[PDB]
Amino acid sequence: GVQVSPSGEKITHTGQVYDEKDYRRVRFVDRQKEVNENFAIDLIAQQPVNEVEHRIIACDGGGGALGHPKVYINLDKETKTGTCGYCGLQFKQH
Amino acid sequence: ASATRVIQKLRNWASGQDLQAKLQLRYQEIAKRTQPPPKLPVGPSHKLSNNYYCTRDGRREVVPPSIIMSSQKEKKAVTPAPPMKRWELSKDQPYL
Amino acid sequence: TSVKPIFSRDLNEAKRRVRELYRAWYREVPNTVHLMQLDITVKQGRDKVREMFMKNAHVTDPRVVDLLVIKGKMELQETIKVWKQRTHVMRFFHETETPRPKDFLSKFYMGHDP
Amino acid sequence: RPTVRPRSDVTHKQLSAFGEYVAEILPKYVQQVQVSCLDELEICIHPDGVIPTLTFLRDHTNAQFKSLADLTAVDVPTRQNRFEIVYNLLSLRFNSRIRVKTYADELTPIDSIVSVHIAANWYEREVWDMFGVFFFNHPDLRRILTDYGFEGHPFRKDFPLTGYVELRYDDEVKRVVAEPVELAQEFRKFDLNSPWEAFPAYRQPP
Amino acid sequence: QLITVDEKLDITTLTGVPEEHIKTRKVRIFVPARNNMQSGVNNTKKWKMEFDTRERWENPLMGWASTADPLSNMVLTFSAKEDAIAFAEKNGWSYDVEEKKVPKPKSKSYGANFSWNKRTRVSTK
Amino acid sequence: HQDLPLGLLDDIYEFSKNFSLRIDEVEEMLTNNRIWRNRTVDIGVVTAEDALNYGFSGVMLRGSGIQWDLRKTQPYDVYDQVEFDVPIGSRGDCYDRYLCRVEEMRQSLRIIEQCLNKMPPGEIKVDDAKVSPPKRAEMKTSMESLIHHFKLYTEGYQVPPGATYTAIEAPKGEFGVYLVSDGSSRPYRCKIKAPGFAHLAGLDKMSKGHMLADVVAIIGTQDIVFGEIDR
Amino acid sequence: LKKTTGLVGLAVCDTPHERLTILYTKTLDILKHFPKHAAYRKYTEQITNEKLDMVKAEPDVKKLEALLQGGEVEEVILQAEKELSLARKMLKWKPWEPLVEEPPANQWKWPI
Amino acid sequence: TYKYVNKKEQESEVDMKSATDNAARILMWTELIRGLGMTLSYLFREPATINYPFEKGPLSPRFRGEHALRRYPSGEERCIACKLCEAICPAQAITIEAEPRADGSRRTTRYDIDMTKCIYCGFCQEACPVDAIVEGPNFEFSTETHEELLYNKEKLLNNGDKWEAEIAANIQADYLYR
Ligand SMILES: CCCCCCCCCCCCCCCCCC(=O)OC[C@H](COP(=O)(O)OCCN)OC(=O)CCCCCCCCCCCCCCCCC
Ligand code: SF4
């Protein structure tokens, strides 16, 4: 979530802030700093872990198309979860 | 289509044609927005056998120019092609 | 080695073509500052012509000289016929830019200009 | 096949025969006749055969190559004669097309053909303006596409894409001044060519 | 109708390029090294001429990469070092030249991985 | 790129129905108007041989009695499977060229009726995924299709070296492309042949023995667009 | 017997076959100067011979053109004049000679 | 097949009838009153005009307008920083800069588009293998400064959040054609 810096500037989803001593803060004077308040890194964490009875699981994101390329993930390592490099979802072996 | 017979006749007489059949404003005769979903075909190379690229590459079937009369390596008189055949007046409407 | 020439056999004929071109320019110059209301003086214009001529003095090839004559004639045409403008003619003096100082130090201090 | 292009040999035959025809009529001013896979006939010649060959092709009864479809130049800076010159010609009596090529460089001009085809009056000016190639016996030869004070031949291979100068209005002098080029986003040079050979038929020997 | 002019060739005054970019420069003629990522050699076959790199700074507005050298993306391709150097001289650029680093011929013997006496014996097949 | 949506041919048919009456609406006002005929007749006359030697193409050729259309001759598409007439002139003037363009607008409807009625089914791009990308489902399910998509949209298809001059019977005449290729993803030279070029070149001769108000019509009779010219 | 050539700037020739004979004969009369080993002579001579055969064998133009395979006889005549001038210019040029100057070996090489 | 325009099939007749007809055409100004009649007929028709801000012109689910960076239902972004858009964009308008995110994912730190360089060709959404960048429907986004058209990841993500209720529907409509 956007949390403000000493100077009074909102931080972005990639930690960008004009140093308090920076002259580039002028462009915001009498204006605003466009920032997105929905952080994917948190919205995906809010999602739960899927469970499957198979040690290998295919992910596409939803619709066959409208999703992403079908990728296959392994679930032999009960220590952690199996994450998709496209959608961020994570699965377990039960 | 929202006009009286008097105006329709006036415009048709002033123009010489009949406009209420060949108007240029569209009134429900047009296709329907929100059409159903399609299911497109697939090409002929969507086989599962006898579909090797060696047979149907194309851009490797090209060959360098066939050179003739390189300066380092009673015939008749011919033309680059047989002379062009002249055309025929139309049958539907040959004038105007 | 041996070559095929262009509009000349030797640098003497080339130089006399050049001198004819200089006659033409030198003579026409003031008509430009008159037609198009340039601020500069005819002395400045003529000094500029001399500078742009001596810029290509080391040249030796009759062909490289004939081509420069051709291009200068093209420019003189564009100028006597009012196709160029105040802008195109004042694009010779560079009134709106400082030059790269010809000093190792003046370069070093600001940038990597070698 | 449905994905490959058809291939007719009658045209290859006709054009090879006409190549032999043209070359044995003009053994001088001729070299490197070639007809390609896609059935197009190129004739390379010496810069001294331009008007002879164009006139022959236009007037000769078997040829009647009247229309000058195009005139072009091409820059290959790895050969001593770097400016290829190309005339694309059309004949309606036979429904045929031909290509006549010659070569040039800097300081080595070509002969003009406005006497033969008057369309060239502007194509040759364009070549001079873009590639820097002079033509002999051209009535007017001057900048046609470029600005009036432009110094350079920009369609070469060594002239940079963005150029050397740049224009803007300055209130002090109240004009559109020129200046060096300072971009706010340098054009990016994508290196795409692949390491793996794609066409063996053109594989050069080492 | 032929003349003899044996002096060195120069077209610098016709190229239209300026002094700053015709004398303050340094050109490099070479064969691009093979990308050790790939094993293809269809890129080490044509010589290439490039220039010295110059300042490439950051735009304050957006952070883009800004320049003033218009010959930073200028790369030329040749089939022969002699032609490359002739072109360089012609235009008037001070050039450095590199040689074609060709790999050596190598003796390979699949049988050497199973010897009875040597060290080339391999421990995993 | 894509196929036609499911409600397009019907609309095109409804349009072709009435474009004829629209052309007639315009012809009533213009073609027989004495003022139009005075502004156009005997203006910008040009003979066939001079046209040829000047490099003209299209209506500027076939308004002087010449018979040259690069769809009836040197056809490139299925045009060989469809019928249409080529209107030729008799005097080489703006009026003849006007009438030629009108009758061309009519032959276009004659061709569109046939194209609609004879539209075949099947694919729309060559099923050679080394040239034309694959569909997105195949891209997202198959390895080879995805590799081909990647390579096509980063380092596109490679073209064997050569040279061509492909001419199209564009509305303004012969549109040509001298395209030179090295065995690379990018071309080495592309020269565009536009008719407006030669037409402007010939404007001076076509404006001989004429006033200041006839030149503005001589120009209009060439359809001078400066994108194809200045490039 | 014809109001129009169908074209512009081409006046009808009310006296055909005559200018044809004249121009073909005056072409031959200059091809004679050309040596025998000249392909231009070798070919255009028989061209004109066949065309003279056609003109002297058929007086009617409606059947003479369909056999000449050209367009209209006025255009055939224009081409005959062009051929005469081409011969007069050939005789001053020297195409029947050998080559002038061979090019470098890497000139017409594509790709490079 | 060819036709003739401005050529008569044969000579006409100089009969008094036809001569008087042509003289009437000349004196009485006949061929012009028909043009007057065409203009009157058009005066007595319905114009094709529309109140713009209240009545809008019709478009299609394929319209290429303003850009948007999309998300997944989860809310996670879609761009995986593969740069195909930057590599195909003819005008070199897309600048991208990526990094590994603290959660170990391929995601961007910088994604900028220049609307004064985009030619609005769609190649970027043709190339995106995940349907993350889309040339949306909007066309009413004019400005007063040249600096409000230099977009960035934040502006594009805001546009996505804004227009997803429409982009998704249009994509559902058209995705079977591509
Ligand atoms: C008792 C018996 C004997 C009595 C003696 C009298 C007998 C009757 C005599 C007949 C009189 C004829 C009418 C008089 C006017 C005729 C003028 C005229 O004819 O103009 C000719 C001119 C075109 O001439 P030209 O270029 O040579 O034609 C083309 C050749 N192919 O045409 C033109 O250029 C005209 C240009 C017109 C452009 C504007 C047209 C606007 C028309 C708007 C409608 C006007 C209706 C009248 C309005 C009345 C006003 C209240
Ligand atoms: S639509 Fe615009 S941003 Fe996308 S690829 Fe085309 S030019 Fe580039």
Ligand code: SF4
């Ligand atoms: S193509 Fe799509 S996923 Fe790849 S960098 Fe561009 S926007 Fe991101």
Ligand SMILES: [Zn+2]
């Ligand atoms: Zn996934």
